[PDB]
């Protein structure tokens, strides 16, 4: 039920508490809460090998802003694969690759990662973060999320 090298006991112990299930309006007859369902994964039929066509379809309308962000210390879905992917989409208004900053309390401005921008699409690295960017770098993740929602530059 748990992916390798991960410990999901804290969330599992919390969500399996009967009073928590009642507060979350969960019907009592439903089975125990598991972080990852092994049976769903085993029976899952993967159909697409690339999202190239999906992103090109979304970018054609020029109505939506797209963001691909990766923690640079992750090996499951490494930053380079997604950087290669965004670059391969060959979009207009290509900007020079630049670092993006985050202000840390009294520790001052720090490089949170690097931004590669194109028209309606940007690729971002989160320096020192793994597969779960908001868990590893919560301040950098919020700063990036805020800039994304408000359509502001990532720098």
């Amino acid at each position: 039920m748990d992916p390798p090298c991960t410990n999901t006991t804290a969330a599992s112990t919390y969500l399996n508490n009967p009073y928590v299930r009642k507060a979350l309006n969960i019907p009592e007859q439903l089975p125990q809460w598991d972080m990852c369902n092994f049976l769903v994964n085993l029976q899952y039929r993967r159909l697409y090998r690339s999202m190239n066509s999906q992103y090109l379809k979304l970018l054609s309308s020029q109505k939506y802003q797209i963001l691909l962000y990766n923690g640079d210390v992750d090996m499951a879905c490494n930053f380079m694969g997604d950087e290669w992917f965004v670059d391969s989409l060959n979009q207009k208004m290509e900007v020079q690759r630049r670092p993006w900053l985050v202000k840390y309390g009294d520790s001052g401005e720090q490089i949170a990662g690097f931004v590669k921008e194109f028209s309606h699409i940007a690729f971002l690295t989160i320096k020192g973060a793994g597969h779960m960017v908001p868990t590893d770098k919560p301040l950098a993740a919020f700063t990036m999320f805020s800039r994304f929602l408000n359509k502001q530059p990532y720098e």
Partner: protein, 259 residues
């Protein structure tokens, strides 16, 4: 105006009551699928703040991981009882919809209990779930809609966004994917390069990879049929995923120790 029946009254583990309204219930997917949602309204101006859908990957993993361990308003503590407020919560500036998807994931279920699915069925079920969300929360129909996700949601989100873009009633404004699976070929090729340059493979394994898997500059570590190449890639997969290194964070320890 809103499903008052789905509203969370007093959540256990919280020392202080939230300033925002929160809901937990079910969204109707395709067929007999009932997808469990946990919706957290914005801490600042919920009526005008954007609606943000969050999907975790797997396939088969719960989006409640995103809430309780990643960017939710409160995070679960190691005791598995206490919840502490998150000062970097994504709900500070957005109405965040955490959806346990597909059916069978976490508290989500189906009446026939058949959880065998695919990319196309998942996108359509997620689309119908979003339609149900807007029927349950009609005051959020005109709000800016953003579709966000992690890992396998790199497939979930763009496929869902393709369906959402065809629906003019949905005010789609963008999409964000965190450490997402966008291409198996781009991911597999980059990982072998990542492994060597992060010091997981030696010069002997790399020289063998460069000589056998590659032609001049271009390397094929995805669907190559060269004999020494397939052998070297089997060793790369063993070092990266089954040797005691945390695949999700190279510099973090492996929970439960090295096998």
């Amino acid at each position: 105006r809103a499903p008052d029946q789905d509203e969370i009254q007093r959540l256990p583990g919280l020392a202080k009551q939230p300033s925002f309204r929160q809901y937990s219930g079910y969204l109707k997917g395709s067929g007999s699928k009932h997808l469990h949602y946990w919706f957290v309204e914005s801490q600042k101006d919920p009526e005008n703040s954007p609606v943000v859908l969050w999907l975790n990957g797997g396939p088969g993993c719960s989006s409640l991981d995103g809430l309780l361990t990643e960017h939710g308003p409160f995070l679960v503590q190691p005791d598995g009882v206490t919840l502490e407020y998150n000062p970097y919560s994504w709900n500070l500036i957005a109405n965040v919809l955490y959806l346990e998807s597909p059916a069978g994931v976490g508290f989500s279920y189906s009446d026939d209990k058949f959880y065998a699915t695919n990319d196309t069925e998942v996108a359509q079920s997620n689309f119908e779930a979003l339609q149900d969300f807007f029927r349950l929360f009609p005051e959020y129909k005109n709000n800016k809609l953003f579709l966000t996700g992690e890992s396998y949601a790199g497939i979930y989100i763009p496929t869902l966004a393709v369906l959402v873009m065809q629906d003019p009633s949905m005010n789609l404004q963008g999409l964000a994917v965190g450490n997402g699976l966008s291409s198996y070929e781009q991911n597999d090729n980059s990982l072998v390069y990542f492994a060597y340059y992060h010091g997981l493979l030696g010069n002997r394994l790399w020289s063998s990879l460069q000589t056998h898997c590659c032609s001049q500059n271009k390397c094929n570590f995805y669907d190559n049929k060269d004999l020494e190449c397939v052998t070297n890639l089997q060793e790369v997969a063993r070092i990266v995923g089954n040797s005691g290194l945390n695949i999700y964070n190279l510099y973090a320890p492996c929970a439960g120790g090295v096998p």
